[PDB]
Amino acid sequence: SHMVPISFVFNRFPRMVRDLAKKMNKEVNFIMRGEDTELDRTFVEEIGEPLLHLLRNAIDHGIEPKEERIAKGKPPIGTLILSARHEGNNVVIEVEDDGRGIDKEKIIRKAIEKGLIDESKAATLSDQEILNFLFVPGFSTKERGVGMDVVKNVVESLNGSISIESEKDKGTKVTIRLPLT
Amino acid sequence: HMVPISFVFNRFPRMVRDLAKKMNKEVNFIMRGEDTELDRTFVEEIGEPLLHLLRNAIDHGIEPKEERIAKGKPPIGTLILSARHEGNNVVIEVEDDGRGIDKEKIIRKAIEKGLIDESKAATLSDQEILNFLFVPGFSTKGVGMDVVKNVVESLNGSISIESEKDKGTKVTIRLPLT
Ligand SMILES: Nc1ncnc2c1ncn2[C@@H]1O[C@H](COP(=O)(O)OP(=O)(O)O)[C@@H](O)[C@H]1O
Ligand SMILES: Nc1ncnc2c1ncn2[C@@H]1O[C@H](COP(=O)(O)OP(=O)(O)O)[C@@H](O)[C@H]1O
């Protein structure tokens, strides 16, 4: 319990999200909540890059170009929310966007290409089983490299847990639960 | 080579009634979609697993008279066995309005087995907890949830579990159509 506010982790994010959104020509309303939520000081340097990766994913793969969102009947401006809070005895961190959602079709194609599953087993996979493929080491693009697989490995190294939720054209929500002690 | 799932379903109503009677449980058993077709190669493999799920619902799910009353629930419990085609899969569901899977019990067993520690246990999602039931050798015993999963997978199928405390449990199995 040598704690510090998660703001030490969150502070650099607004400017980075702003620049990233500009680089990929996306309109992003970035909201951070609960920056006062405290966490183990030893988590600060390990959780920073993983969270940044999730934010990048939201802006790059999630939030759609203004013209695409309109065709979908959604506001031109996309919304990306990073939040932290205390739940029970954990620090819960969420990264949520109202983007296009994870393309499960593509994940299955990747799973098959990487020999992680036979095509005959792909047809009956549940949504959660499909999304879980993102946590298999080596699944992310081969760039110290980033990727959801690395995010999960880091979260597990902190004795924590991670879950993903997503609905086509609705959005994506990643939740990380870290132990306080 | 397709046959109606009634090939598998027909013996369940009598077996459910018999089970409920022996276990002193009041159960209204509802079977739906008996005409749903599935590959003939699945028939001799899915029978025992499904019966085990029905058995689980009656034994571990539906609570005894006094307990349901205490929870504000009708004395007669409900057990629904369903079959249908969804997407391009045969979907079979087993649902009860019983006590729900005891997630704390699982967590305690996980800690005892040394698979998880106290701190980690508190971070687990409900699906992660329920999932331990699929781990070979995790539970008792010789059909177990781990055996049900293996058989389903061997048919290139998938299985998932959903449960809410004191609400009930629902197990879904998806089998290939092609
Ligand atoms: N927020 C999101 N919205 C939509 N798709 C996403 C999101 N996050 C991840 N994805 C999808 O999941 C796949 C994997 O991301 P990741 O594990 O970071 O690997 P990579 O470097 O290969 O993209 C992505 O390539 C993208 O298709
Ligand atoms: N429908 C259900 N409602 C409540 N608990 C259940 C249900 N199905 C299974 N369980 C719980 O999950 C644990 C194991 O199920 P399983 O592996 O099928 O074994 P078994 O019935 O032989 O103990 C059970 O011991 C019980 O505690």
Curated annotation (Swiss-Prot), chain A:
GO molecular function: ATP binding; phosphorelay sensor kinase activity; protein domain specific binding
Domain Histidine kinase intervals: 1-181
Keywords, comma-separated and alphabetical: ATP-binding, Chemotaxis, Cytoplasm, Kinase, Nucleotide-binding, Phosphoprotein, Transferase, Two-component regulatory system
Origin superkingdom: Bacteria
GO CC terms in record: cytoplasm
Compartment(s) of residence: Cytoplasm
GO biological process, one term: chemotaxis
Function (record text): Involved in the transmission of sensory signals from the chemoreceptors to the flagellar motors. CheA is autophosphorylated; it can transfer its phosphate group to either CheB or CheY.
Name of the featured protein: Chemotaxis protein CheA
Taxonomic source organism: Thermotoga maritima (strain ATCC 43589 / DSM 3109 / JCM 10099 / NBRC 100826 / MSB8)
Gene this protein is translated from: cheA
Entire protein: shown range: 353 to 540 of 671
From Swiss-Prot, chain B:
Domain Histidine kinase: 1-178
UniProt-annotated location(s): Cytoplasm
Role summary: Involved in the transmission of sensory signals from the chemoreceptors to the flagellar motors. CheA is autophosphorylated; it can transfer its phosphate group to either CheB or CheY.
Entry protein name: Chemotaxis protein CheA
Gene name of the encoded protein: cheA
Residues of the full protein shown: 354 to 540 of 671
